Amino acid sequence: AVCPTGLFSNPLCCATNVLDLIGVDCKTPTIAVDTGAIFQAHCASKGSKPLCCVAPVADQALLCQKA
Amino acid sequence: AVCPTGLFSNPLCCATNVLDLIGVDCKTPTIAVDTGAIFQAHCASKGSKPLCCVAPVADQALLCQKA
Numbered sequence A, B: 001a002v003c004p005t006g007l008f009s010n011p012l013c014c015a016t017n018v019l020d021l022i023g024v025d026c027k028t029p030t031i032a033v034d035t036g037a038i039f040q041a042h043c044a045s046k047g048s049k050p051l052c053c054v055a056p057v058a059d060q061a062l063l064c065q066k067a
């Protein structure tokens, strides 16, 4: 997968990050993200970072880890 | 690598985990853990899980993410 299983299992595209534990301005991908390269490329095309977060939906500030 | 870069970049072998945010009874690897398979096997040989943690030191309870 592109994220580990467990709490931090949801791939999101986030505008930025804080201390590799929080994602800021996070949105769900608009494609299936089958590989890490594709996840990174998809988010990058929107200016965002590919993070693995605790929720599968968009929000302004989330617990997220680096992919 | 076996851990992302950033704050949670330190591979440790931890006896257990809590909420994919805490590693419990963590120790540094005693061999080089240069691939995910080697990391997993090494930690498993001590009954432990391969976690990516915020410090490169043995510690009983610290911030760690799933690899």
Ligand SMILES: CCCCCCCS[C@@H]1O[C@H](CO)[C@@H](O)[C@H](O)[C@H]1O
Pocket: A019, B054, B055, B063
């Ligand atoms: C938002 C929390 C960010 C976590 C940073 C962990 C860096 S690891 C460890 O953390 C100790 C506190 O538990 C600090 O006293 C010590 O200086 C630091 O090296």
